[PDB]
Symmetry: D2
Subunit: 335 residues, 4 copies
């Protein structure tokens, strides 16, 4: 048995990486790759837009308006789409009996104001918000193993929570000093699109979304702790490195922080813990891992987490959740 | 006395570099910087779009529809605009008594088919074509010293002709084998614009305009010799490196090629001739020079020419011609 | 049954990519990874130097002086070493009964002067030169299927010959005009090493080895045709793009060139032929393919070939040959 | 009158930028450029190593052992050298009557343990430590206007203190929460040198000097406040961007922070204050400025400061101090 898999928004950068993994996956194959109804890319091959897939996957991109053209007989739907589209589509696919893995921010947080403030829309499916599993794979339980709607976390929130969650859960941080998360992403995180801001000559190094980015409250809500989160656009296509600075609870030691991380991740295959030193970004790009190292001096902690923004930050985590949902090896198709 | 200077298309990448030099120039200053009538940037400061100019030049960008708003009392007009715009505007500014330095391809070659084939328009000003000085500064005579319309050469044609012209003029090449010019440009050569092709993640290394680029016939017409010309888009913002491979006329030697170049360029300040070895691109970026080195083995020549595509390839050559036209030191404002 | 596999020079950049593939390969595993006798990296883990391998392969790097420490029971030896080392070691491993896949230039060409001129040493194993299979995988016959010494071609020669060989073999080029091969490589092609020339700030774009590079005569000897070959160091870590300009034999057409390439490569899985247009480098980096596109106008041909310099240009071709030698699927471990 | 100017360590990256400015400066010219006694670059031209200077400055690099070969008649000495060399040389040049501008860390902080802990040497000139002016140009008074020894601040400390000093001096920060300074530098900050760590393929994005970097205590001592300082090596040659996160003193507002910065910098020409938004690194590279923007939400401040690491972070600040010391326009030669 193989899972029929629909990939919506397949022509974007995250979408291309989903096509790669699902094609490769021994237990899944693709029914269709869709674009929007009036997409200029309708009828082009996936490999025309993403030539790394030439000779590997060459499915045409089909324009989708009514989802009934694409829902019957589909086991898994990946929504590699922005929130408005995912808000509209996900309920329809669930009703058609599909298990939906939404990469958008649309179902990530069970809260109305969250959507009004940071996404600028009123959320129309409160029941789904309650039902959605937050697909932070290393930490999800069996709301996931048996959810039919999985909200895959954002790229920056993924590294951030992998670094911070075990420490906060062990009460190792003095949260009266909000953790400061500074992160730099490659430009693929902006999406495939012609805009001035992601135009080649416009990229160097700059912070953005200062005190405004929608990933900040996602990280704060899910960790149960206020944080500073400042993203930066760097002049490379792929990867996120996060440098995270905290005040430890008084008396907390290096060995104590190491114990908490060793216990969280030693049997988690997609998290690579550095015993000493801190990871370099190149060492994870094109791989599905999150790499984590840290240092302690006195009452301060600096923890550093890297990932490929399109892999553990998007497509690989999505597929990793599908593996958990459907009972396959957790890393199946990823490594 | 100072020259009143209008810069049309000031908000583009070449335009910003013209603003820098003209501001700096002791004998010129700026009356206005214009954008198109319905430009989204109308009313923004030049330094909002190009923050390297913050605190240096902060003139607002004015939308221009009727040129009579901007022509009276203007000594010099730089058209940092594409050919259609330059075709329309340049005749009007000349009639208003301005000396026009057009950066577009619109007046570069005295030939009708040239425009139909490579620019896809029928040229409406044959007399101007006859009158335009081709602003390849090291080689222009007194059609320039006294022209009122200067067509500034394209960026790739500039390095190409500086390398090849003295050799062809000394009959040192066997032109039965067309020179092969392979060049790589930084992405600023594509212009300021949101398109997929110059989007950050879409750039790596690729040839383009293969047997179609409009700079090929400009180079061939002006050199009086058929050439292969293949440009490549590289993943850096600024600079052009050209590697040019020729068959020498039988018996032609290294010393003979060196003599021809030494004689062409020894007293030309913006051309830096390498006695031995070949230039690296970083050594000219942000400078107004063209750097040239070469090697000979047997009957083959390899000559290598670099420039900053926006400086000697665009703005600096434009200003260099203005210096010649108006009698200032050739390098005034450039270095 | 699995092949015991020794990787000599494992700590270099090509060596790391061999470790990755051989680890992954279902029919091979690694006995040891070696460094030189007094290497500063002796005793470090492979994944300390190449952290992309963390949690995947963590074999220590062992210093090797006498090969008898490492030869018994070894089926396959990869020499990821420079020519002098490979010249000394390969004969010893062959005598111990190992099948040797040398990545160096040491056994690539059956000719003495070749070694004196371009490698600056007199070759001491003429019989081995006669015996070595040249591992250009798409073109090798059964000198390979049954060779015990395979000389893996250089990175630039690989793309060059894949583009040119089928055309020359079909007499489609006028070789009175030598093909001009201009290529740009990422800096990994320089090897892992601290030198000024591959130091970060020293890299931009520059030709090198002008009329001197050792890959030129390898390409010319094996193609049976004189060529110009000029490599360039570009400011990126991985990939080679070659732009190759030829004069066609009189009367030769686009369709005729396409037929020759379609017939050469249609059933060759690691060569991806572009029907129209020319490949972009990013689309092959991290993949084992060589991508080829071309254009014809009049009597000129421009053919463009890309590869990952460490994969099809080094490690993947090495492993591909091993697959052919030992009877595994040609792409086994590569894709 | 012109100042005779000696540049020691001229062949390094900062040294090359000093040569550029001093050459250009109307009131200074160069007596000699020196390298170490057994330097491999002795006798090479400055422009051989730094070809951007070809045809502009072509002084040979002279090996210096005894300083009496180079001290008589010299008005100004720039030491573009590391601390041990500067510790040894600066006292000798001062004794010869030269005004010394040391770019090393050797005289930056009046404290012995500082040198033992972070520089691993016992400082032999306590009187000089007392006499040295700290050349943070916007803040220096008349210990500078009349010092004969100027310790030019480190590159990262410069942006950091320009951002933080006016805020701390106005008591606007709650220093019970140490400011967190995360910074990314281009690889030129590592110096000209062949090492693995600054080799092209070894650079991507990585923190370094975590809780160990010598710039941390320099920043903390001079600000009179404990800080976290974590530098990162990024994959570009030039520039530093610092993102600095603070807890404000209770009640402190955006307008209050803006007032303090406007008052500090409005008449300081090399500091470009952003009224709204935060600077992008490309907009300062190759320029002598420090660009500063900031945002406030609630009780947190994020202030962002950029500079060219070799210009305002090194050579331009050095020259700026010389201008102040000798009474020239502050920006003379810089812009
Ligand atoms: Na599959
Ligand atoms: Na783990
Ligand atoms: Na001016
Ligand atoms: Na010259
Ligand atoms: Na294996
Ligand atoms: Na094929
Ligand atoms: Na001077
Ligand atoms: Na200011």
């Amino acid at each position: 048995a193989m899972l029929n898999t629909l990939i919506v928004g397949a022509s974007g950068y995250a979408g291309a990486e989903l096509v790669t993994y699902v094609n490769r996956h021994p237990h899944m194959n693709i029914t269709a790759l869709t674009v929007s109804a009036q997409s200029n890319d309708a009828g082009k091959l996936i490999s025309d837009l993403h030539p790394q897939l030439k000779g590997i996957v060459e499915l045409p991109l089909q324009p989708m308006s009514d989802i009934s053209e694409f829902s019957p007989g589909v086991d898994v739907v990946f929504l590699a789409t922005a929130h408005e589209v995912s808000h509209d589509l996900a309920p329809q696919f669930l009703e058609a009996g599909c298990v939906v893995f939404d990469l958008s921010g649309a179902f990530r947080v069970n809260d109305a104001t969250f959507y009004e403030k940071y996404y600028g829309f009123t959320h129309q499916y409160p029941e789904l918000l309650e039902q959605a599993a937050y697909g932070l794979a290393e930490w999800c339980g069996n709301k996931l193993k048996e959810a039919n709607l999985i909200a895959v976390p954002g790229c920056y929130p993924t590294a951030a929570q992998l670094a911070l969650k075990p420490l906060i859960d062990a009460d190792l941080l003095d949260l009266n000093q909000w953790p400061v998360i500074n992160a730099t992403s490659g430009v693929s995180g902006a999406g495939r699109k012609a805009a001035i801001s992601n135009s080649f000559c416009e990229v160097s190094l700059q912070p953005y979304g200062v005190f405004t980015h929608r990933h900040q409250p996602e990280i704060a809500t899910h960790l149960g702790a206020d944080v500073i989160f400042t993203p930066h656009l760097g002049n490379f296509p792929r990867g996120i490195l996060e440098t995270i600075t905290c005040r430890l609870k008084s008396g907390v030691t290096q060995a104590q922080v190491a114990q908490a991380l060793q216990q969280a991740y030693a049997h988690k295959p997609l998290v690579r813990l550095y015993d000493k030193g801190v990871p370099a970004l190149k060492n994870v790009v094109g791989l599905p891992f999150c790499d984590i190292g840290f240092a302690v001096q006195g009452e301060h902690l600096i923890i550093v987490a890297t990932e490929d923004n399109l892999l553990k930050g998007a497509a690989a985590q999505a597929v990793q959740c599908a593996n958990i949902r459907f009972g396959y090896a957790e890393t199946q198709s990823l490594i």
